[PDB]
Write a protein that binds this ligand. Structure first.
Ligand SMILES: CS(=O)(=O)c1ccc(-c2nn(-c3ccc(C#N)cc3)cc2C(=O)Nc2cccc(F)c2)cc1
Ligand SMILES: CS(=O)(=O)c1ccc(-c2nn(-c3ccc(C#N)cc3)cc2C(=O)Nc2cccc(F)c2)cc1
Lengths: 492, 492, 492, 492
């Protein structure tokens, strides 16, 4: 498969009540190609004026007697299935948008990102009419049962590293439970989300059920975060910004909050692991999606006996990593998202050099246009170094060394982040000892980034609150109502 | 049974690491008898220095490979079953200690409060080894499972409405999941919790698993909220302080938060019901626990056919409600908790007379000695009156009128709270339409505040976040960890 | 919608390994139009020889490393969704087949049976990747989890009253869990099942996963019931044959057994109920699909206060019930399935007149061709009469009177059949009383025949073993394997 | 703990309605200690007349509105926890009378059989109030929920090799769900079950909730199977009788059947495991309880590299096992249950020495101090010997040899039995591939026989139907009833 030639950007307006609207201020903002820097198009810039309108529509679409509220639970699933069909039909167009907007390699956005989007919508389409309450045997002459209802208007804010995928992970479980959505995609990458508005209208969702508002964080985002008519907010996923999301939630109307924040995920490589397999898996664990994943990956602990051999082949693998244009089927790594990310990475690269880390390869930017960075590897990294803490959303792999399994566990847990961990060993005792001792929401054994629509995802400690994906992602978007009836009889 | 004669307050210290301690400052605050104003005793006053030492004890008792961690989950239940036995043994003392401290009648404290305290422990004693994760059939050659691990150190702040019940409702699920507890009772009523520390040590819980710290809210409670070493705060109290708890969690720790806030809960009485049963149940929905209940039936909606009849028996019975010492067996209504709330119950009962509301009996007090307030009935209330919109933690009963069911549904959900609602009818259709239409976490049909260890609670909107009790109460003290293992084949 | 004009019966051979085979004996058997008595086509007759080939085809398709065993669970759902897509395209053809071969009125086969067929496949298409095991916190240093694996080859026998719907109800849950199927439709109505064989091959199901063998009971059915290579049997039909299935299973290989055996389901009409609603619903619960429903409300208990006028309204409703050709849109009632059922109904109608029942209307066969019978009503049918005890599969309504809820509860339960119940009342206490105090797998309140893909349904006593549909239908097609790992330290 | 000195069998009569009765015939049957051959006491011999009397008692205690029905589910749990207390109190008495009757070493019966009994009662004491149904979101104006209700009278037939452990594993889940029980202990060892009848009436269970009917299989056991007043049967015994049980059930009233038939469980041991640990767990895998376990533990495969070192340390441990009297503390092996069981395994011991298999030790006995067969170790056994395929419930170890993981999985699955498996290895991929490829209900990794109260236990293939001893054990004793109510409007 190949990218769409030229490709027209048809959808650049605000999506409210299934109509394309201009911004109330008339303003727009540009969207760039991170591989070249060219301005790709311009998008309506939503502000508090537009956010209030979408909440108004989402509230009306959620009132009793509404088509969305009345709709059979199985029919909410059929709409999700219909949406997944339109995404598969336009799988090549949406993958091209993700490449042009996010700098992701095309074949990556086609076989990974778009695959996850389709499978997420298909998975949650099956959960619609299977969200069960319970009947409970309470003391006394009572009949007590439990109803799971939708909370209401759900404001959602998603980031730029996985634009379409995060868009799916946010709306699929929320619609599955019958909520209405007001979602703001990242200002850098709003194109794939706006195209989703066209498919949503094509699938037949009632008006106002899904309202997409592109705009900036301090404007549209802060309007959502403190809106008194919004009942639940879901944010992804900077740990710093997430502090204010949960700050404005409590100061406004006490929304229920879900967070999917960052992490400095460790990756333990015991000496008794498939060496050729571990070096490639730890490399893809760091360098996938230009290092722009919350599930990196940065801290790689390797046992000393195989440390110098692991470092050697990791450097060989990093040097041959093909960095180039996203539309090229040989490219493995695209550019970074923007200049601010590009600057912050090179700063963090220079901090490691100025602190005793061995720069084995790379170290600076690539080319003159866009935001390409060399695949770089820092050796002899210690726990106190600046690059040891501080997540680096870039292609920088950092290899540490360790003795004793008890030491690597204490160090890998010695962190305020607890999103993800990965251990590589062939001893079942070592694998289950570490995985049960890790303070992380997802722990992979002999793999990395093994994500799926069936397995829940989310971090420990300051890596987020609540879990997405799987059945446990449905618990974020429901509200338990208990009903107790006085019974004359009461029998078993 | 009979109140314990000449009972001394043996435990007035601070419970850290299964030991009694003084304030690091040496400060001390007094506890009062609201039926009399007498100073009961003096308790140590904890603060940031003492809270820090409680977190250190709780963090060590939660350490990997601790006694509390390696312990079989089944013995976690037998430890909680043992606590229930000690409470059952010392039942008369605790009901006495709750009567002298909280101002509740001894027999109600004996038959209601402690019956629920005992049941809550025995209930969660069985859940301890029945906390289940899941193995997920997932795409690709993988084997994915989850394990429900305890979050960690849990800070808990309970009010004075039910000093012992709220204490049990908090620590029972937390310890059942395997957490450590840094709990802070209310300033007015910290004694029943301090005796529990003795039973806790007597039962055999390892030192540090439960830390009881009496003190002031803005002094000790804020130290729990802002402590970077606490993984989760669970708060029950006023809605305004719950917003700060929400804000204090985002400003510092991003800890998981469970709030349980105010009420102002509707009580819909239909014409086809039993007036004799509905009058008394609605009367006990207001005046139970001296009107100091988050689930108090504030607004009563009576059908137009039977309203003036409803008020007649209501006011009639409300003149027979005995208000006396909480130790006389005939007494049903004790005193209000203290002077700040005593004056507040009256400033708003003045607002009722000041507005179009029509008083039908009481409204002043008794002189007496403590903080006793007359059983007051109001009538011909309108929806916009301040009193039909202010959470009154006092024995005042406001009785409205309604015509159609569609009107009473809109008038009931028109409030920012949403903890509780109740319907009284014999019609199957009216009982089910109204019960589903309400926006509350708990809906009763032909009963009121019939709670149990089973079934969750609750509830909606600005009244709380999450649910205690039932199975779902456990979900707020667990932590879901996903483990994915690469497998060579994957069959089935 | 209109029936397909002159319909080709294209698929009349045995379906094994996604191929069309002739009978090893070379025999064929005829299929008849129950409304005209004329022959429709000839079908290959499956015997013990053909059953043997199907078993080894289904056994081979279930072997480790096969396509069906290694396929993602989500893809087993994709194939089920595609199968539902192919049914909705050929919805008019299959409804024509079922109307032609079963005597059902066309519009009712199009809007009820075919709707349930589609909704069933869609519902179970979602369950595939959502069948979860559990992780259990057991005593000692262990890690215990559970997998739900498919049982293996499932033999299934379905009746003739809902040929297509029973076909979907049986193969959807079995395929959802990953089993292979050997299914034998009733000899009277094998055609729509054989057309499903073509859709299965078109949908892309691997060969041998589904095998359809049309034939007779003592030949095809008996060979399935006693096959040593078949792991589970699922029979739906008469209670008499249900005893032989559970017997042959014990004599062969102790294969698991599911039974749906029907019964004599009561319908209780209280004077508190909507009379005109209950008259119409209870008349639908007796006469639906020519009275050939296992859930038929054969015994209608009516309160004496409204007995004589409920009876009269029912007689008027029966006298205007339109009987005619299944292809005519005005027809509500078609013919019975064959001469054997036709005679059994006419003999039971004679027993009612003999034992002293008031034949209020109808009671004799209508016309010369086909197997049409007049709508029939009885009265004062005391519990000892034969029509009150024996299950009638015909358009015969039987009305009893009662005096007390406690009396009608005991009378309705006095039966070896406990499949389905129904109470009509507007009081919630009476609705809770009967529904909880009855021995029936499904209790409908103020409705009848409200079947879903989401609700279980099954027998209590001699009316079946286990359930189908809902979540609980899946547990009858899954083996639970427990895996326990000795782990080093174990930290709960 | 020492065995009770001169214990007298106080309880010798049949237990019906919490009363001791004699047999309706007056016939009695003698019970023997197989470690002395001397007759110990005489027990009333139950038969059809006594079985009919117990069913009528069991049916009345289950009738609607009874004490057992109306009783709160949580108090059903308190009654179970009370039984566990009395068992731990009379722990010594129940221990010695299990060694006197069953013939097991006293400290084994004290620290194994009794530990399992107390944990089983206390594990199911918590499940009683936590059996939940579910509310279903179905299509249309309906509200659908399910209730998990007890089936009714349940007949149980435990074997002789774990009289008290099987007694708890049977009645605890049944009573947990609210059933009534008619249980028949083994004719070889009925005494400890009879004492439990005293502890039952001591604990306070209503009369008739549990009835103990000591007798013979072909006499009283068959009266349970063929009784039309019993809604469900649970066997546990030999595969041959279990086939007859499902025939007697299908021939009568279609009662639900769950069997625990046991068989030839394999045990794989790879060369990368600790030999000290592997040979010891393999010894106790087939030598525990004098080899009279369903698991067993029979076919022990060993990799080539360590086979002739495995047998060296095995025959060391075999001739080191101190056989003797059950009361001697230094005794590890006891006597077989009786002479016919003693006679069949010697008939099979010669069916290896004569079938070409090599013997390593034992193979005779030690006199006639009882029915003692000395620790015997085989070697060089092939798969199609009568020894490696049949019912050797004695202390016979069968050490096989295998080469490839693929080969031993075929050779281990090649069995009509397959109740349990076990694999010893440190390789993560080996332990995962083998454990998933096994056709067994329980498979252990680096352990054996590690049964716990929390984990379900059952059999695959022909040993056979149903699961017990977990959450899923509850499913076996509950009936699912669906309740659907027509509501005025959806709103979902
Ligand atoms: C959240 S709350 O602080 O607002 C509150 C509200 C109501 C009650 C309450 N109230 N009553 C009550 C009793 C009698 C009458 C009368 N006449 C009126 C009310 C009973 C309860 C109650 O929870 N029981 C209970 C029972 C079993 C287990 C358990 F854990 C708790 C307690 C606290
Ligand atoms: C179904 S069965 O009749 O085939 C059978 C099989 C194994 C055992 C068994 N065996 N052992 C065992 C003990 C020691 C040694 C040694 N050395 C070897 C095996 C322990 C058990 C056992 O169930 N424990 C248990 C523990 C806690 C709770 C509970 F509910 C059950 C019992 C019956």
């Amino acid at each position: 498969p190949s990218p769409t030639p030229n490709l027209e950007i048809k959808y650049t307006k605000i999506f409210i009540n299934n109509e394309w609207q201009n911004s109330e201020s008339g303003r727009v903002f540009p969207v760039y190609n991170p591989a070249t820097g060219e301005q790709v198009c311009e998008v309506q810039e939503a502000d508090k004026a537009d956010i209030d309108k979408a909440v108004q529509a989402a509230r009306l679409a959620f009132s009793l007697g509404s088509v969305w509220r009345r709709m059979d639970a199985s029919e909410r699933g059929r709409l999700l299935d219909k949406l997944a069909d339109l995404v598969e039909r336009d799988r090549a167009v949406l993958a091209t948008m993700e490449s042009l907007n996010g700098g992701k390699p095309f074949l990556q956005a086609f076989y990974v990102d778009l695959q996850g989007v389709i499978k997420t919508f298909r998975y949650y389409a099956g959960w619609a009419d299977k969200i069960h309450g319970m009947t409970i045997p309470v003391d006394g002459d009572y009949f007590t049962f439990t109803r799971h209802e939708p909370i209401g208007v759900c404001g959602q804010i998603i980031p730029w590293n996985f634009p379409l995928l995060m868009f799916a992970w946010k709306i699929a479980p929320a619609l599955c439970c019958g909520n209405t959505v007001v979602i703001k995609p990242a200002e850098q990458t709003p194109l794939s989300a706006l195209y989703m508005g066209a498919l949503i209208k094509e699938a037949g969702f009632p008006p106002g059920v899904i309202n997409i508002l592109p705009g900036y964080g301090p404007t549209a985002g802060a309007a959502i975060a403190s809106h008194i008519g919004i009942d639940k907010i879901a944010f992804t996923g900077s740990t710093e910004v997430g502090k204010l999301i949960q700050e404005a939630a409590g100061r406004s109307n006490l929304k229920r909050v879900t967070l999917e924040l960052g992490g400095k995920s460790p990756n333990i490589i015991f000496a008794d692991a498939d060496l050729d397999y571990a070096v490639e898996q730890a490399h893809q664990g760091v360098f996938f999606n230009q290092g722009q994943c919350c599930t990196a990956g940065s801290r790689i602990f390797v046992e000393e006996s195989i440390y110098e051999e692991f470092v050697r082949r990791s450097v060989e693998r990093a040097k041959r990593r093909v960095v180039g244009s996203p539309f090229d089927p040989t490219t493995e790594q695209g550019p970074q998202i923007d200049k601010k990310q590009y600057n912050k990475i090179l700063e963090l690269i220079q901090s490691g050099v100025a602190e005793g880390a061995k720069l084995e390869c790379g170290g600076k930017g690539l080319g003159r246009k866009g935001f390409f960075i060399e695949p770089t590897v820092f050796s002899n990294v210690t726990d106190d170094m600046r690059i040891a803490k501080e997540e680096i959303f870039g292609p920088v792999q950092e290899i540490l060394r360790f003795k004793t399994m008890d030491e690597v566990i204490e160090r890998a847990n010695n962190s305020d982040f607890g999103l993800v961990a990965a251990v590589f060993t062939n001893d079942i005792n070592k694998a289950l000892t570490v995985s049960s001792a890790m303070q992380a929401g997802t722990v992979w054994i002999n793999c990395y980034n093994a994500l799926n629509a069936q397995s829940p995802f989310g971090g420990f400690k300051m890596s987020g609150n609540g879990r997405e994906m799987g059945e446990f992602g449905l618990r974020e978007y429901s509200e338990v109502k208990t009903v107790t009836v006085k019974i004359p009889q009461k029998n078993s």
